[PDB]
Design a protein around this ligand. Sequence first.
Ligand SMILES: [Cl-]
Ligand code: NA
Ligand code: NA
Lengths: 329, 328
Amino acid sequence: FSLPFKLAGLGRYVPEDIVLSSELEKKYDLPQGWCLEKQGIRERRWVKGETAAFMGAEAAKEAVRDAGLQLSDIDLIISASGSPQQAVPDGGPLVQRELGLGRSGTPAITVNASCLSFFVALEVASNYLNMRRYRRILVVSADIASVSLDFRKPENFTLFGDAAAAAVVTLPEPGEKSCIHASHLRTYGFGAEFSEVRGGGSRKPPNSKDTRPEDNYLHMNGAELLKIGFEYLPKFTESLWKQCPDITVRDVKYIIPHQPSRVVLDYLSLSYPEEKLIRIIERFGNCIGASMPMALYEAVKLRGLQRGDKAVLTGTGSGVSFVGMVFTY
Amino acid sequence: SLPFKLAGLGRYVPEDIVLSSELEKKYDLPQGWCLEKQGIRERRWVKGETAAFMGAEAAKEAVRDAGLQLSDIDLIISASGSPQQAVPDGGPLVQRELGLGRSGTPAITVNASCLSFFVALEVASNYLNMRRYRRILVVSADIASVSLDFRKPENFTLFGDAAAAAVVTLPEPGEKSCIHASHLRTYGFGAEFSEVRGGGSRKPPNSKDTRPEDNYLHMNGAELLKIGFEYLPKFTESLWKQCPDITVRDVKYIIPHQPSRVVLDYLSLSYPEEKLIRIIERFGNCIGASMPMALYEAVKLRGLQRGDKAVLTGTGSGVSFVGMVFTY
Ligand SMILES: [Cl-]
Ligand code: NA
Ligand code: NA
C-alpha cells in the first residue's frame, strides 16, 4: 500500500549574514579549522533582526509560488519549527499574520516534535489530505538558534545556525506518482534528559529567581544519546523498510537526513554511497527544526531530485525520537 | 459523520485550594471581587508537581477508564496550552512519566495555545480513521500559577492549574459515537491582543534586552471582543451548516473552553443554563486543561451518556475559534 501525497512546492529563507567558522575561531581562541574538523561546519547564517515568523513567511511565499498557488489557496497552515518564537500565541497564527492572511480565517496550528517537527507535520498533513478535510496545506519550519547559544561551550556555539524552509502539500493529480511507501516514528522518552532545555516553561520559568541562566541552554549527553541508537536503531530501520518490501535503499536516489551534527552524515557515509546523501550542515550548521526541510529543498532545487524518483527522509531528535519515510517525489 | 469514540477520561486536580477570599485579603482587593468580576470562587495551584506528573496522573485515569493498559496506547499526543520546558516537548516527557520511556510508543505535541485539546482530538480522529493508530492518548496539563503577574488583579486572580486527558478510539460496530460537525478558524491579526513575547527567540530569557514584562501575558480585551463581533456569527453558521438535521435543541450539553466568565455569560444569555458545563468557579482559567476538564465533568458528574449529543467549543489566543458537534 502507498499513500497519495505530493510535495507540491518548496521554499527556503536563509539570513544574509554568512558567519565563517574561521571568524568564530579567531574571536573565541579556537584553532584554525577546528569547526570544519570537529563539527563539519565551514559556515552558517545568523539573523540580524528578523523574526522567526518573518523567516517562515518568506519560505512559505516561495513554496506557495512554487506550487502554482496564491496565498488565498492555502486552507491549513502547520507551523513546525524546532523552537518557538515566543510563548503565546503559537507559530501558526504568527506566520499566518506575517503572510497577510491574518483576517482570512485559514486555520493555523503547530505540530511539535522538537527538531523533528517538520516530519511529524508532514504526517499530520498527509492524514488531513487523505481524509479530504483540507486540500492545500502549508508546512513551515523556521528556527533562530543563534540567540540562545552557550558561549561557554564551543561544541554548542559553533554548532547552530538560523534558517527556515517550507512545503506546500496536496493530493497528487492523475498521472502523478507522488506517494508515501513507508513511514515510522518511535519515541524513547527515557532519553529526555540526554538532550534537554530545562527552562522555557512552567518547570523553570524565565522570571523565577529559582531559575538559573544555565537552565535556558541546551544540555546534551552524547554518550547516552548514542546508546539509544545502539539499542533501538536497527529495529527502527527494519520496521520501516518492512513496510515496503519491493523497495530497498538501492532503489532510492537520495537520503535526506535531519543533520544536527556531522555524526549522522558520517554514519550514513559509511553505509551508503556518497552521491545519495544530501548535505547542508557544512553551510548552514544545525538549524534545528529547519534542518530536514532545508535538506529537502536542497535535494529538489540544487541536486535534481525529480518527480518519480524515490527518496528517504530520516532523523533523530530530542525526546528521543526516530523518524523515517520512504516516498516517491 | 466521522466515527470517533471518547473511550476514557481522566483528570488531575492539585491539592491546594486557593480561595479568592484569601487573594483578596493579601492583595487588597474588595471582598467578592473575584467572584463578581472573574466568576471565580477558588482555583487549584500546584505545590511540587511538574506538568508531566499531572498529565500522567490524568492519563492513567483515562487509560483505566477506557479498559486499557498503558501498553495498549499506540500514540500519545500532548496538548497543553503552555509547555513544561523548551526541550523536549510534552509528549516524550509524559511518556517517560507514565513508565513508557523505553516502549517506543510515539509521543508528540499538538499546539493551538489554549485550544490544543480540541485540535489534538481532530488530529487523533484522522489517525484513527486512516487506521494508522487505534488507541490514542490525548493529555492536557497546564501550570499557569508560576507565570502570574501580581501587578495585575485581572491576571493573577484568573488562572489555576489542572490536567485532563482522553483516550480515543474508533467505535465498535453498532456504536453511535461520532463527530457530526467540526470547524476551526484562525484570525492571526489578533495575535497581539493575547500575547506573551518571551519564551522563545524573539525575547530570549537570558538576553539583556528582555524585560520581566515580556514574560507576562498581555491582553487587549476590547480588541479580542471585536474579533468575536466580526467573525463569530459566521463561525457559528459555518459549523451548524455541516449537520442540518441537528440543532442546539438536540444537544444535551455545551462544553466550553472557559478562559473567563465572559464566555459563560454569553452562553447563558443564549442557551438554557442546564445545558452549560461550568468549571471556572472552582478551577479558574486552566488554559489547555479547561475544555477537557469540562468534558470530564460532563461525563463523570453531569451524566452525559452514550448516544447523547454535545458540543465542544472555545476561543483561544491566536486568535482561533473551535467547535464540534458529536454523539458521545
Ligand atoms: Cl471546517
Ligand atoms: Na470572597
Ligand atoms: Na493555533
